Symmetry: D2
Subunit: 381 residues, 4 copies
């Protein structure tokens, strides 16, 4: 019923599993990203202007009460903010943006923080038998990353296993997937070298360990660790956070803010849990229809999360897209996939692409475990 | 921008900690409640008519990928449904209803399942040191119920401790709180005896243990376990689930459904984390304003979750409410408080009160850990 | 140089998660030891006890030096030389043998021997905790299984090897069940007639929150016999064509036992009446899987060591009944009169607290010699790993 | 009846989470034992070994009967009588004493004694796992602390009691540091000159994923000495006015040691050359907190038992240096020539694998007598709980 504008975005670097962000919690990473975003829009006062935060997170175990609430308060936002945490597995942070946009369109909020955070490193092990007792015989300690993040709830198989099934189903070879993975790494490394992520990234302070000096994590860790022979001769596990600030048109005028983009529309779809990898081919058309884009060729750039090579290959094929418009800075296969964050990360990167590569209309898409996908259409100002 | 109707509601009985629902997971309880609700509206086809599920859950550890998704699929809903899980601590299930209503008002869905589920019994223990190793010296196994459910994230104190602080702050004595608790138990027991919960409750099948016969859990477990002397001479830990079905006016006409109530409005507010108990006094006025209710005396019944006695006492006082209109079937202090469920449970019970006690306008409210509260106004048909 | 048993005592044997679940292995050890000390006041706790050697298998979470703790908790002088020994099921018998050897060499004049075990309060282990699990599921190991009940070489339970033994010596389910029933019935009769009353010292259980203290005074397992359910019980170790079940095998149990040994010198100086003389002992081992009939090798060695050249001169036999097959095989191999063997019942009916049973059988044997008019007695116990220990005693 | 040491061997001592982290306690035991067996081929593994008594403190997750596993993994006959003994730090010395007693009584003619320990691979325990935690946080206990390093009565670390000892006998931080430095420097010199080469048998470490196998050939701790950092190291057990630190205390370590004992009879029949004679031994104990100077009580008893009436007739002393204070106090109390004590260094510099150290000091002592031209030697080791063990050997 009314226009929703992105006025600021930021994200942390993406850390490797047990890597450079191991000492940070998911909430701490969330606060860093959000503080990075708030700094760019000082016209919005932290103590009064922010009505709501909706934040993505998948592995909430041991984060404490209300992760989104903690993120807001740690970032210096007023405790009057309405906070909620949302989980749509991989799509969590995208769903947060969509829910934020809906909230603005309904007139129930004027300024919304959306985004997400995840520390897959610091997701704990669970002991299901601890409370009632094991009684006799061995019992299992469950890895929370696997159980709640990476494995399908219905067959127990890892997302990478389902990505392989999808490749077989669409007659995409192992070699094709490897080629694409390698190509994606090289695009990610090149985009890094050329400073393409510099505007979106805010660094993370790492406390020096008992006399060691403090330092900063400034860049995505995963791209430099490509090993071609190993790849040819599955789960990307990562840590990170991303944040975006959404405002109504009204607020944009009263506070004299520069809009970065307008949320034209969004679409969500789902089908068989095992077929999640090509669920974006269902969500994208719904989003384009919602945005009033009749022709798919009017879109300038596409960013899929593309955590697996098959996701990039299949969805481009099904949608009949020009591959030169798709994931021009690389994808999650190379950059990493912090589950609760990635959904907003693709939107952050998409917006950077539109600004830096001279695009006007962009669509972001992300598939999620459970069989779903989410998609958003934005137009640069 | 358009009317949202409740067409069906249901809930499980509320189990005691390590009690009658110990053998059920949060997802299984969710499916029971949702199947209970679907059965009442056969005009809506499970295979085609449901666009979205938004489901509350706080303790997601060891539930598997995407609890809301699992609930939908276990209840027999089509895998085309758009699923997301939301956490607003105690208010989770209320927030789900609000997000569902917003989704309908925006024209992005026509039929939404909202509600929530929780098994505090089967929330696991965590081992934070398991992944990287403990190295040397003792390490702690964390109770997930405490860490993510009951304890405040900022000071680490249980919700009951903050309820006591609130009582001191508003000069409400220990004896007053005990009186109210006891009174609430007796109202809950009486409402149970008179069959007041019979229409909303659907039973839970319990599998008989190796030759023992299967049975059904049909009633709320907590009310019968009142011990007055013990009370006079803190955390209510419970298991359960609740579901509500929301539709647009359009759908209500095309499918020839009987509306039970209309969602007139809602309001959310927050302040200091330690003061969560009287956050409903901020949320209720916002909800009434959103619903266009100028006078608070036009409301016929109030249902607060009222997990602690102080919540009932303080908020009634601050809002200057007629105590005979407030929590006439009792409250969570007596019935129990399954965190991710209670937010929808109060709406379910409120609607039952309006139908059975001859009310037209009702407001439900629920405070949550982190300092927030959510509120909804409904009008019976 | 003669070694005399001067006093014995044991706790009641508690069931798994049963009547002694609130007590640690050390606490049970102290009860048994104090029970034994009380019967010989001539020996002063603060001066006369040179050494303690105490059996225990599951030492995890007991704290530093279980035997030492048992001695000090029982009020013995901190000058006592303390050591803990583990020979699995035969631990406590090995403790007596090592105590005898110590007296024999003149190193000690008064030795406390025995054993204790709380299989209930044995903890779970996390092998991956120290270095980290990194990724993927990891296991919490049950200490009872890993260090007590499972073979170290193939990882199979003692019951699986009891089944192998049943097959190799063609002992049927029927035979085992009848032996089990017999063991229960004898155990119940002995309890009824007070045959364990001299042996047993009660365990005080603390009443929590203001309820009065309660007393555990008898063995918990014998009362559970249900003959019909026993005969139709499922085969637990082998699904198809099995013979061993939960009811014809020894259960998991808690308890302790203690015996006081003295030299001939001390016997005369303190004017103590000796209950028995340690005539000899024998230990043997072979294949781990064949532990069930290792006592048939150990017994002959003990008799030879004692100077008994005809096996029929011994009046009573106490074989630890870890399984019904153990009682049946060793009686058959040694070609013994079954009426001389385990006359008060055995571990199938009374329970099997691993670290304790080795001394428990000696404690009971001595009572049998005193009460049933026997002079010569042999105790024998098999142990996981393929071994067995045996001791010959003569009543004075 | 004479008891002769006929062969000795030990593994290198690995650091905590260090060079032997991939090996279990049993595996290290087998290496040491096989090292010892190799030096006496006249003794056949399949027939001549009657008994094994092996020291081990942290038995959790080792599997049934650690000593038995060590024997069988080393290729000994499954007819061997096996038992595991625990006397905390003195376990392995107690194993030798019990082996000697066994030979002396004629029960055995050839005994394997020694000990093994992997403090690295000792697991964490979960006491609440079996019955359930119910509600609220629960603790995962470090087995190293609970059963190895902490006193059972007050729960304080051995280092806290070492501080008490420093205060009670007025031994300064400076004195301890200088003793520590001295121990490191001697240890390094001995390593340089190959003084441990006869003793030590190397441990093969499996190379994972196609990398070649590697070899651990020397003790890991001695190379870590940094004198300046040692002198300014923080006091770990006592914050204010502390004396004991990480660098002047023994570390946490992995390793194993083995000695082969025979009767005079076997010595002549198999035509073995004896390395030493067990002249005697002595054990004593007192207050748990005073364990550090318990060796000063044990040593006199051993000398009396051996028939040595003047302490100056002994050529070399091996005291286990659990802490720098232990070396200093016991030398002062016994009024010994410090140049006769721990001439190759000690546990502060070499490491202290609890279940192994008791035999390790005997192994090293014997090497000292052979290489430094000594005849009479005494080894002594204190243990948690307030005890100490001591043994007197004479080179042949």
């Amino acid at each position: 019923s009314q226009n929703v504008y992105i006025v600021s975005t930021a994200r942390t670097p993406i850390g490797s599993f047990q890597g450079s962000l191991s000492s940070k919690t998911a909430v701490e990473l969330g606060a860093v990203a959000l503080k990075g975003a708030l700094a760019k829009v000082p016209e919005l006062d932290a103590s009064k202007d922010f009505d709501e935060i909706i934040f993505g997170n998948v592995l909430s175990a041991n984060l404490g009460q209300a992760p989104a609430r903690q993120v807001a308060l740690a970032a210096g936002l007023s405790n009057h903010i309405v906070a909620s945490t949302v989980n749509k597995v991989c799509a969590s942070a995208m769903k947060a943006i969509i829910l934020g946009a809906q909230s603005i369109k309904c007139g129930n909020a004027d300024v919304v923080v959306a985004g997400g955070c995840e520390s897959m490193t610091n997701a704990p092990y669970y002991m299901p038998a601890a409370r009632a007792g094991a009684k006799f015989g061995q019992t299992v300690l469950v890895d929370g990353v696997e159980r709640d993040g990476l494995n399908d709830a219905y067959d127990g198989l890892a997302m990478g296993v389902h990505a392989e099934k999808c490749a077989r189903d669409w007659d995409i070879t192992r070699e094709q997937q490897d080629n694409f993975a390698i190509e994606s790494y090289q695009k990610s490394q090149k985009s890094q070298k050329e400073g393409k992520f510099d505007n979106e990234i805010v660094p993370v302070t790492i406390k020096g360990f008992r006399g060691k000096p403090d330092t900063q994590v400034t860049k995505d860790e995963e791209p430099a660790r490509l090993h071609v022979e190993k790849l040819r001769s599955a789960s990307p596990i990562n840590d990170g956070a991303a944040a975006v600030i959404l405002v109504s048109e009204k607020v944009l005028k009263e506070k004299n803010l520069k809009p970065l983009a307008i949320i034209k529309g969004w679409g969500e779809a789902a089908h068989q849990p095992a077929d999640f990898t090509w669920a974006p081919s269902l969500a994208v058309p719904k989003a384009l229809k919602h945005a009033g884009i009749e022709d798919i060729n009017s879109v300038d750039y596409f960013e899929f999360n593309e955590a697996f090579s098959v996701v990039g290959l299949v969805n481009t094929k099904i949608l009949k897209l020009d591959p030169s418009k798709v994931n021009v800075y690389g994808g999650a296969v190379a950059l990493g996939h912090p589950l609760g964050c990635s959904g907003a990360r693709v939107v952050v990167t998409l917006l950077s692409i539109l600004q830096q590569e001279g695009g006007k209309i962009g669509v972001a898409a992300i598939c999620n475990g459970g069989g779903g996908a989410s998609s958003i259409v934005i137009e640069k100002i």
